[PDB]
Ligand binder design. Structure first.
Ligand SMILES: *[C@@H]1O[C@H](CO)[C@@H](O[C@@H]2O[C@H](CO)[C@@H](O)[C@H](O)[C@H]2NC(C)=O)[C@H](O)[C@H]1NC(C)=O
Lengths: 49, 48
């Protein structure tokens, strides 16, 4: 037979932070793996796609 | 995206990966087992 009823209130503003995107890197395979070498660039073609 | 993943997986069978031929039957027609196993391990590793 007991109830508690609030007689006043507080307006609280609470921050929420969410990730939405991330840095759009691109790493070119041939320039990463070989870089200017034609010898390496030809060996890397044997590994296909 | 599924069709492009399967097409890429199938086109990789044609790659050498460092073996003398990308065809398993070429290695086994051309080479005897002691040297053939060296060419086949390159294809196994690349295909795996
Ligand atoms: C409900 O609460 C607010 C505060 O949360 C009360 O207003 C404050 O009351 C105190 C004490 O009188 C003052 O010092 C403040 O200046 C008032 N304003 C604020 C914004 O804090 C309000 O009186 C309460 N009402 C009830 C139902 O008791």
């Amino acid at each position: 037979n007991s109830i508690a009823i609030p007689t006043n209130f507080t307006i609280s503003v609470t921050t929420e932070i969410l990730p939405v995107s991330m840095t759009k890197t691109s790493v070119d395979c041939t320039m990463y793996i070989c870089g200017d070498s034609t010898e390496c660039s030809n060996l890397l073609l044997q590994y296909g796609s | 995206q599924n069709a492009q993943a399967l097409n890429t997986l199938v086109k990789q069978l044609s790659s050498n990966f460092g073996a003398i031929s990308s065809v398993l039957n070429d290695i086994l027609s051309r080479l005897d087992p002691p040297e053939a196993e060296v060419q086949i391990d390159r294809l196994i590793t690349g295909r795996l």
